[PDB]
Amino acid sequence: VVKVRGLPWSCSADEVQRFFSDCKIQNGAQGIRFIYTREGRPSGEAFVELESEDEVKLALKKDRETMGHRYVEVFKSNNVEMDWVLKHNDGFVRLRGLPFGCSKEEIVQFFSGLEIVPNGITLPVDFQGRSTGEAFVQFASQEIAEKALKKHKERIGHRYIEIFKSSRAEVRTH
């Protein structure tokens, strides 16, 4: 059990196997289990199933290896962590592809109508410190969040802010 982060949303199961060629992935391609959202799309974070305990060190070795044009975070995990995953009531919204220096003030001004819960915007950072380009948003109600989803690609600066219906589980994993 080796948790992965920063993987692309348009990647294949063989791409992570080719990325982790040094390691012998248990249960072939089935072992490289992706973590999906409530919408169904892949999150960007995966759950790799390393066969041997010695291969875990070989897996963790590529902690900041460049998969094309981005850094991939690699971290050790427990089998219990993999079991507790929710993919398939909640007022969460997965925001994706945001301007570089995008502020919480910019995001609140964007959804000027739909109410956000206190400190709703939970904008996460990469291991280096920079913003991931994605964000979260806990609205006051699920019905409020549903309305937010209607603006699924409005321009913020010069970016179609892709909005997806997420959950608290995805927010806790980030």
Q: Please, what are the domains in the chain?
A: 1-86 (3.30.70.330), 87-174 (3.30.70.330)
3-state secondary structure the chain: CEEEECCCCCCCHHHHHHHCCCCCECCCCCCCEEEECCCCCEEEEEEECECCCCHHHHHHCCCEEECCCCEEEEEECCHHHHHCCCCCCCCEEEEECCCCCCCHHHHHHHCCCCCECCCCCCCCECCCCCECCCECCEECCHHHHHHHCCCCCCEECCEECEEEECCHHHHHHC
Q: In the numeric block, which tokens belong to residue 68?
A: 């094309």
Residues written for the chain: 174
Residue for token digits 């490289």? Answer: 32
The CA-atom distances, in angstroms, between 65 and each of 57, 127, 154 are 14, 13, 33
